[PDB]
Amino acid sequence: HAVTITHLFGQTVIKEPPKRVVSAGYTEQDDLLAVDVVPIAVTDWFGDQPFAVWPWAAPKLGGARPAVLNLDNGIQIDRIAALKPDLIVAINAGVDADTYQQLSAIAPTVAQSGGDAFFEPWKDQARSIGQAVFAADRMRSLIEAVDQKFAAVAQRHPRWRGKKALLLQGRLWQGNVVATLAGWRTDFLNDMGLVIADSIKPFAVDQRGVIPRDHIKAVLDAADVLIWMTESPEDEKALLADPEIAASQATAQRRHIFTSKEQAGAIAFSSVLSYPVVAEQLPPQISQILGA
Numbered sequence: 001h002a003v004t005i006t007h008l009f010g011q012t013v014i015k016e017p018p019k020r021v022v023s024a025g026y027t028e029q030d031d032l033l034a035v036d037v038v039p040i041a042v043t044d045w046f047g048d049q050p051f052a053v054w055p056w057a058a059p060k061l062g063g064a065r066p067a068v069l070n071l072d073n074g075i076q077i078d079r080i081a082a083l084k085p086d087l088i089v090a091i092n093a094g095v096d097a098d099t100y101q102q103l104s105a106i107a108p109t110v111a112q113s114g115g116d117a118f119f120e121p122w123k124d125q126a127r128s129i130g131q132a133v134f135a136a137d138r139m140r141s142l143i144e145a146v147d148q149k150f151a152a153v154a155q156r157h158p159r160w161r162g163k164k165a166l167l168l169q170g171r172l173w174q175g176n177v178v179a180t181l182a183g184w185r186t187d188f189l190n191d192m193g194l195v196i197a198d199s200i201k202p203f204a205v206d207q208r209g210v211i212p213r214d215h216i217k218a219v220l221d222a223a224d225v226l227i228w229m230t231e232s233p234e235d236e237k238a239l240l241a242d243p244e245i246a247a248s249q250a251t252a253q254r255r256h257i258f259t260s261k262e263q264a265g266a267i268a269f270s271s272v273l274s275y276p277v278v279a280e281q282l283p284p285q286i287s288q289i290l291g292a
């Protein structure tokens with residue numbers, strides 16, 4: 001009956017399907033809700049959503065009103081203790097050896113599997129959640145359905161094959177474009193037949209490309225389509241006002257996509273519930289730029 005999870009800080013034994021789950025990280029609520037586990041607490045990340053559950057996942061709450069935790073002054077260890085959980089899911093929470101001891105003193109705790117304390121590969125997060133809440137087979141079909149949905153996009157748009165994409169943050173950082181590097185977070189673009197432009201590779205800092213101002217134009221001009229994870233029309237305005245972005249062929253040839261807030265959220269969550277939103281709402285935008 002008992003499930004043993006192996007993670008970065010040891011092993012956690014879950015004796016039976018959990019009844020009172022805390023979602024301690026930024027995104028685990030999506031994968032829990034997907035297998036009909038409503039958390040007694042969800043942790044806010046951004047967007048000021050009600051109960052920190054974004055629209056694609058909100059229906060699964062079934063009217064439930066979880067406590068909303070935050071990481072503004074670290075993990076709210078005392079609030080977690082007061083919720084009396086029987087499982088703490090803390091995969092995307094910045095857990096370290098010390099906070100893991102604090103969480104484990106309250107309840108069986110599932111930490112991240114590796115060197116990413118935040119935003120480990122989404123499928124490894126989804127499979128761990130699936131094991132922990134005794135829904136591994138259901139979670140397997142939900143992962144498969146995301147891959148199927150993006151493959152279906154590719155089947156409808158064979159002309160996209162080998163076109164070059166970049167996935168950028170919705171805001172400059174201290175004057176720099178910030179690109180998502182090729183890795184798990186860009187697999188959904190490869191799934192639709194695109195490639196990630198290699199112009200960002202020399203500018204790596206951990207999992208992102210921080211583009212010096214004197215390289216912004218040449219790096220953006222390598223791509224056929226640019227997806228900016230803007231969260232507001234003000235974000236788009238500030239990107240198009242940047243003198244290097246403004247002077248680029250990406251701007252002259254209208255190769256930019258500026259996401260709605262919901263689409264930015266859906267990419268940011270990269271979950272079994274959020275990726276379908278991306279598969280539905282991004283392709284028609286790409287089609288405007290590359291042609292169907």
Ligand SMILES: O=S([O-])[O-]
Nearest residue numbers: 121122123124143
């Ligand atoms: O982790 S594999 O499923 O991409």
